[PDB]
Design an enzyme around this catalytic site. Structure first.
Site, PDB file in Angstrom:
ATOM      1  N   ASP A   1      -4.357  -0.885  -4.028  1.00 33.45           N
ATOM      2  CA  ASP A   1      -4.397  -1.513  -5.413  1.00 33.45           C
ATOM      3  C   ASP A   1      -5.822  -1.685  -5.958  1.00 33.45           C
ATOM      4  O   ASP A   1      -5.997  -2.324  -7.000  1.00 33.45           O
ATOM      5  CB  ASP A   1      -3.534  -2.809  -5.448  1.00 33.45           C
ATOM      6  CG  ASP A   1      -4.078  -3.914  -4.610  1.00 33.45           C
ATOM      7  OD1 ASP A   1      -5.277  -3.810  -4.149  1.00 33.45           O
ATOM      8  OD2 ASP A   1      -3.290  -4.859  -4.367  1.00 33.45           O
TER       9      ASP A   1
ATOM     10  N   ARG B   1      -9.046  -3.431  -9.981  1.00 30.70           N
ATOM     11  CA  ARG B   1      -7.866  -3.981  -9.359  1.00 30.70           C
ATOM     12  C   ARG B   1      -6.702  -3.762 -10.309  1.00 30.70           C
ATOM     13  O   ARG B   1      -6.774  -4.093 -11.464  1.00 30.70           O
ATOM     14  CB  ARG B   1      -8.080  -5.482  -9.115  1.00 30.70           C
ATOM     15  CG  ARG B   1      -6.936  -6.234  -8.528  1.00 30.70           C
ATOM     16  CD  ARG B   1      -6.459  -5.698  -7.172  1.00 30.70           C
ATOM     17  NE  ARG B   1      -5.581  -6.603  -6.474  1.00 30.70           N
ATOM     18  CZ  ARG B   1      -4.266  -6.714  -6.706  1.00 30.70           C
ATOM     19  NH1 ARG B   1      -3.677  -5.912  -7.628  1.00 30.70           N
ATOM     20  NH2 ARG B   1      -3.512  -7.554  -6.015  1.00 30.70           N
TER      21      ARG B   1
ATOM     22  N   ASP C   1       0.742  -5.997  -6.065  1.00 29.78           N
ATOM     23  CA  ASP C   1       0.121  -6.389  -4.818  1.00 29.78           C
ATOM     24  C   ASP C   1       0.562  -5.407  -3.773  1.00 29.78           C
ATOM     25  O   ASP C   1       1.698  -5.409  -3.358  1.00 29.78           O
ATOM     26  CB  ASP C   1       0.454  -7.837  -4.484  1.00 29.78           C
ATOM     27  CG  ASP C   1      -0.410  -8.383  -3.332  1.00 29.78           C
ATOM     28  OD1 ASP C   1      -1.581  -7.998  -3.232  1.00 29.78           O
ATOM     29  OD2 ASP C   1       0.106  -9.193  -2.589  1.00 29.78           O
ATOM     30  N   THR C   2      -0.368  -4.627  -3.290  1.00 26.93           N
ATOM     31  CA  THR C   2      -0.150  -3.781  -2.168  1.00 26.93           C
ATOM     32  C   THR C   2      -0.537  -4.556  -0.899  1.00 26.93           C
ATOM     33  O   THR C   2      -1.365  -5.446  -0.918  1.00 26.93           O
ATOM     34  CB  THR C   2      -0.968  -2.476  -2.261  1.00 26.93           C
ATOM     35  OG1 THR C   2      -2.341  -2.770  -2.535  1.00 26.93           O
ATOM     36  CG2 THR C   2      -0.374  -1.558  -3.317  1.00 26.93           C
TER      37      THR C   2
ATOM     38  N   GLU D   1      -2.596  -5.255   2.480  1.00 28.36           N
ATOM     39  CA  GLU D   1      -3.956  -4.921   2.918  1.00 28.36           C
ATOM     40  C   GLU D   1      -3.801  -3.763   3.949  1.00 28.36           C
ATOM     41  O   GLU D   1      -2.734  -3.597   4.527  1.00 28.36           O
ATOM     42  CB  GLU D   1      -4.638  -6.146   3.574  1.00 28.36           C
ATOM     43  CG  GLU D   1      -4.852  -7.357   2.656  1.00 28.36           C
ATOM     44  CD  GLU D   1      -5.590  -7.020   1.359  1.00 28.36           C
ATOM     45  OE1 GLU D   1      -6.561  -6.265   1.468  1.00 28.36           O
ATOM     46  OE2 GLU D   1      -5.166  -7.490   0.230  1.00 28.36           O
TER      47      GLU D   1
ATOM     48  N   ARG E   1     -14.081  -7.478 -10.712  1.00 27.67           N
ATOM     49  CA  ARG E   1     -13.284  -6.258 -10.687  1.00 27.67           C
ATOM     50  C   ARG E   1     -12.626  -6.088 -12.015  1.00 27.67           C
ATOM     51  O   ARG E   1     -12.131  -7.068 -12.613  1.00 27.67           O
ATOM     52  CB  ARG E   1     -12.146  -6.323  -9.570  1.00 27.67           C
ATOM     53  CG  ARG E   1     -12.657  -6.399  -8.143  1.00 27.67           C
ATOM     54  CD  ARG E   1     -11.600  -6.472  -7.119  1.00 27.67           C
ATOM     55  NE  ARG E   1     -10.690  -7.579  -7.381  1.00 27.67           N
ATOM     56  CZ  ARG E   1      -9.671  -7.907  -6.583  1.00 27.67           C
ATOM     57  NH1 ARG E   1      -9.448  -7.214  -5.506  1.00 27.67           N
ATOM     58  NH2 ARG E   1      -8.806  -8.859  -6.957  1.00 27.67           N
TER      59      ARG E   1
HETATM   60  C1  LIG Z   1      -4.378  -8.764  -9.781  1.00 33.54           C
HETATM   61  C2  LIG Z   1      -5.273  -9.930 -10.099  1.00 33.54           C
HETATM   62  C3  LIG Z   1      -5.922 -10.610  -9.048  1.00 33.54           C
HETATM   63  N1  LIG Z   1      -6.728 -11.632  -9.311  1.00 33.54           N
HETATM   64  C4  LIG Z   1      -7.381 -12.429  -8.252  1.00 33.54           C
HETATM   65  C5  LIG Z   1      -6.411 -13.527  -7.855  1.00 33.54           C
HETATM   66  C6  LIG Z   1      -6.593 -13.660  -6.377  1.00 33.54           C
HETATM   67  O1  LIG Z   1      -7.602 -14.706  -6.097  1.00 33.54           O
HETATM   68  P1  LIG Z   1      -7.829 -15.115  -4.557  1.00 33.54           P
HETATM   69  O2  LIG Z   1      -8.781 -14.059  -3.935  1.00 33.54           O
HETATM   70  O3  LIG Z   1      -8.612 -16.326  -4.841  1.00 33.54           O
HETATM   71  O4  LIG Z   1      -6.592 -15.155  -3.777  1.00 33.54           O
HETATM   72  C7  LIG Z   1      -7.054 -12.267  -5.951  1.00 33.54           C
HETATM   73  C8  LIG Z   1      -5.972 -11.326  -5.411  1.00 33.54           C
HETATM   74  O5  LIG Z   1      -6.518  -9.986  -5.304  1.00 33.54           O
HETATM   75  P2  LIG Z   1      -6.214  -9.106  -4.020  1.00 33.54           P
HETATM   76  O6  LIG Z   1      -4.723  -8.977  -3.855  1.00 33.54           O
HETATM   77  O7  LIG Z   1      -7.000  -7.831  -4.298  1.00 33.54           O
HETATM   78  O8  LIG Z   1      -6.788  -9.893  -2.862  1.00 33.54           O
HETATM   79  O9  LIG Z   1      -7.513 -11.638  -7.077  1.00 33.54           O
HETATM   80  C9  LIG Z   1      -6.867 -12.064 -10.646  1.00 33.54           C
HETATM   81  O10 LIG Z   1      -7.581 -13.097 -10.898  1.00 33.54           O
HETATM   82  N2  LIG Z   1      -6.286 -11.437 -11.679  1.00 33.54           N
HETATM   83  C10 LIG Z   1      -5.477 -10.403 -11.460  1.00 33.54           C
HETATM   84  O11 LIG Z   1      -4.923  -9.924 -12.469  1.00 33.54           O
HETATM   85 CA   LIG Z   2      -3.645  -6.533  -2.045  1.00 34.32          CA
END
Ligand SMILES: Cc1cn([C@H]2C[C@H](OP(=O)(O)O)[C@@H](COP(=O)(O)O)O2)c(=O)[nH]c1=O
Ligand SMILES: [Ca+2]
Length: 129
Positions: free
Chosen positions: A15, A29, A34-35, A37, A75
């Site tokens: 993702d 991103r 959500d893929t 890890e 991102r």
């Molecule tokens: C997809 C997405 C993730 N995020 C943030 C929320 C999550 O915060 P936390 O890191 O604090 O959990 C994290 C999840 O991304 P990942 O799934 O790449 O880890 O990325 C956003 O803020 N907006 C979005 O649209």
């Molecule tokens: Ca992920």
């Protein structure tokens, strides 16, 4: 919403992908998914799925939604298209991502994706097996 050009710099995981956008390198991103890890079940399969899709594409496009275009980690947040096919939807359709991170104002394609997740779940694909 509208599509804009970008070029692949590097597939990262299921993702996230590194793209050149308006001439600058940026990690993106994918919205609304959500893929797993890489170290989790189906993580390698998600990464390989996204990698193929973006590396094989003649044309990558990004589409921002109506809200925030960057997350707290810097991102980019977008829908991504590989020769006109949405990577975000294709992952969900294959059961390699869940619909997730659905925030108000960046959710234009939510129900499209949910419809794909429902068909994936019906088929007991990958994550849903
Ligand atoms: C997809 C997405 C993730 N995020 C943030 C929320 C999550 O915060 P936390 O890191 O604090 O959990 C994290 C999840 O991304 P990942 O799934 O790449 O880890 O990325 C956003 O803020 N907006 C979005 O649209
Ligand atoms: Ca992920």
């Amino acid at each position: 919403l509208h599509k804009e050009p970008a070029t692949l710099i590097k597939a990262i995981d299921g993702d996230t992908v590194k793209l050149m956008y308006k001439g600058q390198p940026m990690t993106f991103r994918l919205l609304l998914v959500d893929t797993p890890e890489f170290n989790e079940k189906y993580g390698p399969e998600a990464s390989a799925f996204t990698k193929k899709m973006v590396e094989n594409a003649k044309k990558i496009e990004v589409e921002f939604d109506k809200g925030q275009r960057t997350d707290k980690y810097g991102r980019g947040l977008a829908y991504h298209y590989a020769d006109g096919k949405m990577v975000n939807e294709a992952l969900v359709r294959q059961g390699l991502a869940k619909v997730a991170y659905v925030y108000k104002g960046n959710n234009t394609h939510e129900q499209l994706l949910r419809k794909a997740e429902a068909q994936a779940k019906k088929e007991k694909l990958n994550i849903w097996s």
